Design a protein around this ligand. Structure first.
Ligand code: HEC
Ligand code: HEM
Lengths: 293, 104
């Protein structure tokens, strides 16, 4: 009886509609620059996009981006999602402006927009996620644990159909934002340039002196005298041989990182969705800069 | 500008790469002590890109107001990874902080 989610584009809407949504997100992003000690909303939007998609279980097609289930308390209150309320609040006036867009399309698009506006690669995006009822909300506990090793990481990501390159690439989003002790019981940034999408995560992982320390919540994290940190799952990418080869590649070649990220993150945001052969081809949105806005 | 406000902006947006005090470390970015009235590319002991080194402008309210809005557009090829402060008032507050803190 396999669960299928057929993409169904918002009626009569096409590239130009979605570009305005993008632009409205991007303008708010630039405007609300104070958030989180001037990091701004970009990182938390990227996190929200990933956590709304990252509930997918490839084996029965439960969870995933399609239903926009994060709007329900059960998922909204997942301990793994603490802090993401801020991204939901950011998007609230955008949803009021475009009541025709689905929640899944909005959450996923917010991530794409944030990555591009922070000068990351272009990320093609497809519309047609359709909201599903409250009883379709996946239970808490599907998102990954930080206090883990490389074997956990690799097997965790297999459930999202991601291979070694996809995993190392996707993790590079940790160039963005920071850990906040009140949210996750980890504290600190992975790098200096918190709101610009670069390969700094890979360069820091290889080049800083990391020391294993207990933080104020008594979790262990890898710390640099520089004031940066790595979660145990991040440091895992250099303890594992096959992971470390890819970290070195990305550290040496940002263009390659960008390409691989773009693919993996689209794939992430599209897992579990069946697109009719009919469907339009992926949309690639212009940045505010490119539009001269 | 508001010195006390500018300082918070600095603490949060600049301090991870820049020091302000005389004799302060060169980190990811150059120490900024003595910045006002001197040319670009003059912090002792820092290795700048050619683009920063030879820009040939003098740092002061006018030139920082423009640079900090979008660093790379004013100095193409800069290695300062910083997208830019878009709000005018915020730049003004930061600049008054800098004018004080880089000259004591
Ligand atoms: C690291 C992630 C940085 C952040 C955040 C900021 N700056 Fe920066 N800055 C950095 C580097 C590596 C350089 C040299 C760039 C080059 O191509 O060589 C700089 C340069 C400046 C300068 C010019 C200094 C000179 O001597 O000509 C100024 C005035 C400057 N940076 C100021 C500045 C301010 C005010 C910041 C917060 C708003 C800021 N920088 C962030 C690295 C980093
Ligand atoms: C093993 C996988 C992962 C683990 C364990 C993990 C863990 C975490 C943790 C603990 C935080 C800090 C949350 C907080 O305190 O506020 C965080 C932040 C973040 N993660 Fe991940 N993460 C993983 C994978 C990813 C992926 C795949 C993406 C995107 C592609 C991503 C993007 C982010 C972003 C952007 C932030 C910063 C948000 C902010 O500053 O508010 N992460 N991650």
């Amino acid at each position: 009886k396999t669960l299928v989610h057929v993409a169904s584009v918002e009626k009569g809407r096409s590239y130009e509609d979605f570009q305005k949504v993008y632009n409205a997100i991007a303008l708010k992003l630039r405007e609300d620059d104070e958030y989180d000690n001037y990091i701004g909303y970009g990182p938390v939007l990227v996190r929200l996009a990933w956590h709304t998609s990252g509930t997918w279980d490839k084996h029965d097609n439960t969870g995933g981006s399609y239903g926009g289930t994060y709007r329900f308390k059960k998922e909204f209150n997942d301990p793994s999602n603490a802090g993401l309320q801020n991204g939901f609040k950011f998007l609230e006036p955008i949803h009021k402006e475009f009541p025709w867009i689905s929640s899944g399309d909005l959450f996923s698009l917010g991530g794409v927009t944030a990555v591009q506006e922070m000068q990351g690669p272009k990320i093609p995006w497809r519309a047609g996620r359709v909201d599903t009822p409250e009883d379709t909300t996946p239970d808490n506990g599907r998102l990954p644990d930080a206090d883990k090793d490389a074997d956990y990481v690799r097997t965790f990501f297999q459930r999202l159909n991601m291979n070694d390159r996809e995993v190392v690439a996707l993790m590079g989003a940790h160039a963005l934002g920071k850990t906040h002790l009140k949210n996750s019981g980890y504290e600190g940034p992975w790098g200096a340039a918190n709101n610009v999408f670069t390969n700094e995560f890979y360069l820091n992982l290889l080049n800083e002196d990391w020391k294993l320390e207990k933080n104020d919540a008594n979790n262990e994290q890898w710390d640099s005298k520089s004031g940066y940190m790595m979660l145990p799952t991040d440091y895992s990418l250099i303890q594992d041989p096959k992971y470390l080869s890819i970290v070195k590649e990305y550290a040496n070649d940002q263009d390659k990182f960008f390409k691989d990220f773009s693919k993996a993150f689209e794939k992430l945001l599209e897992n579990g969705i069946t697109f009719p052969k009919d469907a339009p081809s992926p949309f690639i949105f212009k940045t505010l800069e490119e539009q001269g806005l | 500008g508001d010195v006390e406000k500018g300082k918070k902006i600095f603490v949060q947006r600049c301090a991870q790469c820049h020091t302000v005090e005389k004799g302060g470390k060169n980190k990811t970015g150059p120490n900024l002590n003595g910045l006002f009235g001197r040319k670009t590319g003059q912090a002792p002991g820092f290795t700048y890109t050619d683009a920063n080194k030879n820009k040939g402008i003098t740092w002061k309210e006018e030139t920082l107001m423009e640079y900090l809005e979008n660093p790379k557009k004013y100095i193409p090829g800069t290695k300062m990874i910083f997208a830019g402060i878009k709000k005018k008032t915020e730049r003004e507050d930061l600049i008054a902080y800098l004018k004080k803190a880089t000259n004591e």
